[PDB]
Amino acid sequence: GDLVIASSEPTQQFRSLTNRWMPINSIRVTVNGKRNDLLAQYYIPEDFLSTHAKCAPNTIPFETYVYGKYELEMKFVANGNKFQCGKVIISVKFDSYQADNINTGFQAALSRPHIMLDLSTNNEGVLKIPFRYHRAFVRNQTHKTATAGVRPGKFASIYVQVLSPLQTGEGGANDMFIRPFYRYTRAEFAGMSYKVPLT
């Protein structure tokens, strides 16, 4: 509805570049973790631009375009031995700008759409993350000539937290890892312009 009106020009999709999976840097899950402590948190799509996956082919169209809508999926993979046990919850929070301090609890994680990873069975989790922002579009990149009134590259936050701490047996592995993946299911881009380095 808001797509066609707000953009005079039609938006473009890059299914070959976007729909493919893409890993990021791993998550260490220790036995030293307590409840409601962050393993990880991400401000999408900025933390898929600047920090993690800089030279990914998924990040090719984000140079040139200055607006877009973003529906993602995020598959997480847990790998621990059968002599451990622990619970990790991952939720999403739409338009989380100036709202990261509050509703950040595991309770809010349960309330918001989430996935529940067991660390013994070694299950996977799929977060269908649609676009819910308080404008028609989100601004893609910051720029030194751009205005400082609008904070770009943040329409949602990911929150990876201990739901229940990891326990191990006698002489067991003291930690196990989780690898996050992501991909774009609906990526529409408006406002073509000259390319820039990503942050």
Partner 1 sequence: DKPKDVSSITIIPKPRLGFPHGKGKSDAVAMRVNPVALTSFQDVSAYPDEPRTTLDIARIWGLRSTFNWGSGDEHGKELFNTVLDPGLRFYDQDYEGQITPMEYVTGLYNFWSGPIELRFDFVSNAFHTGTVIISAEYNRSSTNTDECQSHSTYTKTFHLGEQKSVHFTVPYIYDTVVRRNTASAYLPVTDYDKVDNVSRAQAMGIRAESKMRVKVRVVNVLRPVASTTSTIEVLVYMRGGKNYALHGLKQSTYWPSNSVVPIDSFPPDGYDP
Partner 2 sequence: FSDGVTAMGFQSLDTQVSIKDILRRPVLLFNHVELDPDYTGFFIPIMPPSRMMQYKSGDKETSFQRLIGRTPQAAIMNLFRFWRGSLRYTIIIHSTDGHPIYVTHVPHTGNRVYGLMKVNNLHEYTKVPIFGCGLTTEMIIPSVNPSICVEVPFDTENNWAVTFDEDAQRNYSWRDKGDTVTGHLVVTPVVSVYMSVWVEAGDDFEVSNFYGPPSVKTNDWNYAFSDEH
Binding site for partner 2 (CB under 8 A): 2, 4-5, 7-10, 93-95, 97-103, 105, 107-108, 110-112, 132-136, 147-151
Determine if 194 is a binding residue for partner 1 (CB under 8 A). Answer: yes
Which is nearer to partner 2, 18 or 104 (by Cβ)? Answer: 104
Among 45, 86, 125, 180, binds partner 1 (CB under 8 A): 86
Interaction pattern, residues 90-129, with partner 1; x per rule: CB under 8 A: -----------xx--xxxx-xx-x------x---------
Binding site partner of 39, from partner 2, partner 1, none, Cβ cut-off 5-8 A by kind: none
Closest CA to 27 of 72, 80, 70: 80
Question: Does position 140 bind partner 1 by CB under 8 A?
Answer: yes
Rg of the chain taking only CA atoms, in angstroms: 18
- How far apart, in whole angstroms, are the C-alpha atoms of residue 27 and residue 93? 20
Q: Does 161 bind partner 1 (CB under 8 A)?
A: no
Which residues, listed in sequence order, are joined to residue 129 by a DSSP beta bridge? 72
From the list partner 1, partner 2, none, partner contacted by residue 67 (C-beta under 5 to 8 A by kind): partner 1
Q: Listing from the earlier edge strand, what are the strands of the sheet with 84-94?
A: 38-45, 154-168, 84-94, 114-118
Contact of 177 with 63, CB cutoff 8 Å:
no
Nearest to 93 by CA among 103, 85, 83, 80: 103
Parallel, antiparallel, or unpaired: how do β-strands 38-45 and 175-192 relate?
Answer: unpaired
Residues 27-66 that bind partner 1 (CB under 8 A): 35-36, 64, 66
